Design a protein around this ligand. Structure first.
Ligand SMILES: [Zn+2]
Ligand SMILES: [Zn+2]
Ligand SMILES: [Zn+2]
Ligand SMILES: [Zn+2]
Length: 118
DNA sequence: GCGTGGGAGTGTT
DNA sequence: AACACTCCCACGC
């Protein structure tokens, strides 16, 4: 005998003989943070799937993004982008305090500068 | 200054 | 939905 009922979630193929058991299962997808890491002793939950798959690069230590200049590898592409700013010397973020023409290569660098102005 | 995590907005298929 | 880019914010050295 096979079960009549099923979860309509795209990926949950759990089937139940009883409707009561499917009802309890249906509330598992009503997800505070559905995506959870299943690496040993991490169990960290995330809101999106791509955020979890980015986090799991910590357990594997993979660095798929490499700098074309200094050959250094990085775990994420955005961190590679600002690393290239270290080589090219560009500083888009400029301080907007009077009589202070100071530029930085990262937004959080300018924020730290704006706070030290006070 | 700069590596390197999480959150979130957006785009392409 | 999967996948990716890209930004801010934050922690750390
Ligand atoms: Zn389900
Ligand atoms: Zn994990
Ligand atoms: Zn480099
Ligand atoms: Zn300034």
């Amino acid at each position: 005998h096979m079960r009549p009922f099923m979860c309509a979630y795209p990926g949950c193929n759990k089937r139940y003989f009883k409707l009561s058991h499917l009802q309890m299962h249906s509330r598992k997808h009503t997800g505070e943070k559905p995506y959870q890491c299943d690496f040993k002793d991490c169990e960290r939950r995330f809101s999106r799937s791509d955020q979890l798959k980015r986090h799991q690069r910590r357990h594997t230590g993979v660095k798929p993004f490499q700098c074309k200049t200094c050959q250094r590898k990085f775990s994420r592409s955005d961190h590679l982008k600002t690393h290239t700013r270290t080589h090219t010397g560009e500083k888009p973020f400029s301080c907007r305090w009077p009589s202070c023409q100071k530029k930085f290569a990262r937004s959080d660098e300018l924020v730290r500068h704006h706070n030290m102005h006070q």
